[PDB]
Every structure is written in structure tokens, then in C-alpha cells.
């Protein structure tokens, strides 16, 4: 969906659904993405440099449910706001010694 707010006032944005890196990116027409605002399993946090301390990522665990509260909104920080996780692991074997004589 979408929303329009008046410059100044807040917005809180919500994400439902083995959690690791969590994110909100935006994009406005014609700009490449921007990554706002991140979350570790641990609870903390990162922010981009244009946020300067008016929103807040948050988690609630037991939804899987992140919000981003942004206050003090401004016209530049108009966009398409998305929530983003990634999943990484490797396995391995157990090795196997090769010995070559010769």
C-alpha cells in the first residue's frame, strides 16, 4: 500500500514472516536502492547516514514481525520502503587425508 504524511509527523512501518540480517531498503523512481536501517539477531542495530537518529528498527521475536518507526519525516525521504532478510550457511565433510608417495 502506500501513504502520504505531512513533513515532520511519524509513520511506522511493519514486516511479518532461523532470523538473521534484517533490513529495511528503500528506492525512489530513478535512484538506486537504499539500505535505511538493520538488525541483527543480537538487537543491534544500523542505520544509514541520513537517518541521524529519527527512526528506530525494532523487533518483536515472537511475531517475526519488525517495525521501522520513522519520525521526523521529510520530503527526500519520500520512496518505496521495503523489509529485507538473507539466509547464509555452508556445510562441509569431514575430510579425507590424501597421502601421494612417490
Known amino acids: 500500500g502506500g501513504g502520504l504524511v505531512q513533513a515532520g509527523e511519524s509513520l511506522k512501518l511493519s514486516c511479518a514472516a532461523?532470523?538473521?540480517?534484517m533490513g529495511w531498503y528503500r528506492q525512489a523512481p530513478g535512484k538506486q536502492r537504499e539500505l535505511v536501517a538493520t538488525?541483527?539477531?543480537?538487537?543491534?542495530?544500523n542505520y544509514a547516514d541520513f537517518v541521524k537518529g529519527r527512526f528506530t528498527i525494532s523487533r518483536d521475536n515472537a511475531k517475526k514481525t519488525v517495525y521501522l518507526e520513522m519520525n521526523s519525516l521529510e520530503p527526500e525521504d519520500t520512496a518505496v520502503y521495503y523489509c529485507?532478510?538473507?539466509?547464509?550457511?555452508?556445510?562441509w565433510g569431514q575430510g579425507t587425508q590424501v597421502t601421494v608417495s612417490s
Open positions: 532461523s532470523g538473521g540480517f
Open positions: 538488525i541483527n539477531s543480537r538487537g543491534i542495530t
Open positions: 529485507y532478510t538473507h539466509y547464509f550457511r555452508s556445510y
